[PDB]
Design an enzyme around this catalytic site. Structure first.
Site, mmCIF file in Angstrom:
data_model
loop_
_atom_site.group_PDB
_atom_site.id
_atom_site.type_symbol
_atom_site.label_atom_id
_atom_site.label_comp_id
_atom_site.label_asym_id
_atom_site.label_seq_id
_atom_site.Cartn_x
_atom_site.Cartn_y
_atom_site.Cartn_z
ATOM 1 N N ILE A 36 -12.078 -6.923 -15.549
ATOM 2 C CA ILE A 36 -12.558 -7.770 -14.459
ATOM 3 C C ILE A 36 -13.819 -7.153 -13.842
ATOM 4 C CG2 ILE A 36 -11.982 -8.850 -12.239
ATOM 5 C CD1 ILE A 36 -9.149 -9.073 -13.121
ATOM 6 N N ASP A 156 -9.095 0.931 7.035
ATOM 7 C CA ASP A 156 -10.281 0.687 6.293
ATOM 8 C C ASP A 156 -10.681 -0.797 6.232
ATOM 9 O OD1 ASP A 156 -11.549 1.597 3.049
ATOM 10 O OD2 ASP A 156 -12.682 1.323 4.880
ATOM 11 N N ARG A 160 -15.827 -5.378 2.396
ATOM 12 C CA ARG A 160 -15.583 -4.941 1.010
ATOM 13 C C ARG A 160 -14.093 -4.918 0.629
ATOM 14 N NH1 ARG A 160 -17.323 -0.663 3.909
ATOM 15 N NH2 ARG A 160 -15.689 0.834 4.454
ATOM 16 N N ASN A 161 -13.214 -4.876 1.633
ATOM 17 C CA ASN A 161 -11.767 -4.808 1.409
ATOM 18 C C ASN A 161 -11.031 -6.125 1.623
ATOM 19 O OD1 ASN A 161 -11.474 -2.172 0.479
ATOM 20 N ND2 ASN A 161 -11.516 -1.345 2.550
ATOM 21 N N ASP A 174 -5.393 -3.820 1.230
ATOM 22 C CA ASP A 174 -5.482 -2.377 1.334
ATOM 23 C C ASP A 174 -5.200 -1.726 0.003
ATOM 24 O OD1 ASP A 174 -2.698 -0.568 2.058
ATOM 25 O OD2 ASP A 174 -2.564 -2.785 2.058
#
Ligand SMILES: O=C1NC(=O)[C@@H](c2c[nH]c3ccccc23)[C@@H]1C1=C[n+]2cccc3cccc1c32
Length: 298
Positions: A36, A156, A160-161, A174
């Site tokens: 991926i 976090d 981006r997460n 996460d």
């Protein structure tokens, strides 16, 4: 090829409590040419998860290469497979785990067509409207409200997460031990412990104590909104870790993006209150942002 864990010396009460998460070797198909994506995080592969009624499920599979021994496997199960039985439309949940005798355990996640939220909004091939971007922020707020209710502290939170499916549903992810390595652009490293620290997303108190709470997740959420409304610009681009801290201590903040509604910027600034207890709860954020999103026309 040096990872061996003896499955049978795993705590029998722990293996009982996690058996519903474990996938058998013949129930997950992974072709190793089918990747991926690749990055600092390692290599994520296409997978097919086979259920009991011949139902094939498209997934993303990743070796947790940072897990190398029974001790780390145990801790991972005690923190990751209990401590993450979550179910919410705006939370990315684990499909399962492959516990291997030879090799690190595998994590299996739902396939997310449009990848991470940051890369999607930075891609000028797509056109998320201002309303769409607030809608993404709203979806994250709902995911975070759910996680706060479960007393889960993310640590976090950042664009981006957050992952985007084919219906453009944002899922808060996460990836604990799933990231092999971390980009130097976004993560500082603690010299003594090796801890990864997403400084430009951390609350002022976390920059001092290295401790995280739901209220520090609220701070990071403010930064995430800023990321959304700038269409994935880097926060504080010119500036090192010390100077960011002085910047914030002076009471200076990330500046209002063009086309960002004043009420939405007020929300960001409240997220960046120096006093943790004075920041809004995720309940307040979902309420506030829902109204901004609903009443948004102009
Ligand atoms: O959760 C997820 N599901 C997917 O399909 C992954 C994905 C979609 N597009 C991509 C393009 C490149 C890389 C991955 C993906 C995504 C993921 C991101 N990271 C980011 C760090 C570590 C992991 C590990 C597993 C799955 C994912 C993942």
């Amino acid at each position: 090829n040096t990872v061996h864990i003896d499955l049978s010396a795993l705590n029998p009460e722990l293996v009982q409590a996690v058996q519903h998460v474990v996938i058998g070797p013949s129930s997950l198909i992974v072709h190793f040419n089918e990747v991926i994506g690749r990055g600092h995080f390692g290599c994520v592969y296409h997978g097919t998860l086979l259920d009991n009624d011949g139902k094939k499920i498209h997934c993303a599979v990743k070796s947790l290469n940072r897990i190398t021994d029974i001790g780390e496997v145990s801790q991972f199960l005690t923190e990751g497979i209990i401590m993450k039985d979550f179910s919410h439309p705006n939370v990315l949940s684990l499909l399962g785990i492959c516990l291997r005798s030879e090799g690190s355990p595998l994590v299996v996640l739902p396939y997310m067509k449009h990848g991470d939220l940051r890369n999607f909004i930075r891609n000028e091939t797509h056109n998320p409207t201002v309303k769409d971007l607030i809608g993404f922020g709203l979806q994250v707020a709902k995911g975070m409200k759910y996680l706060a209710s479960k007393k889960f502290v993310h640590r976090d939170l950042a664009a981006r997460n957050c992952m985007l499916d084919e219906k453009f549903t944002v899922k808060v992810a996460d990836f604990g031990l799933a990231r092999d390595m971390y980009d130097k652009e976004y993560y500082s490293v603690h010299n003594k412990t090796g801890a990864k620290l997403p400084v430009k997303w951390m609350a002022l108190e976390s920059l001092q104590t290295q401790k995280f709470t739901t209220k520090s997740d609220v701070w990071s959420f403010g930064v995430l909104l800023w990321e959304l409304m700038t269409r994935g610009a880097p926060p504080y681009p010119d500036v090192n870790t010390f100077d960011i801290t002085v910047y914030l201590l002076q009471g200076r903040r990330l500046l209002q993006p063009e086309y960002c509604p004043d009420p939405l910027y007020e929300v960001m600034l409240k997220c960046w209150h120096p006093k943790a207890e004075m920041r809004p709860s995720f309940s307040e954020l979902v309420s506030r942002i829902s109204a901004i999103f609903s009443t948004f026309i102009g």
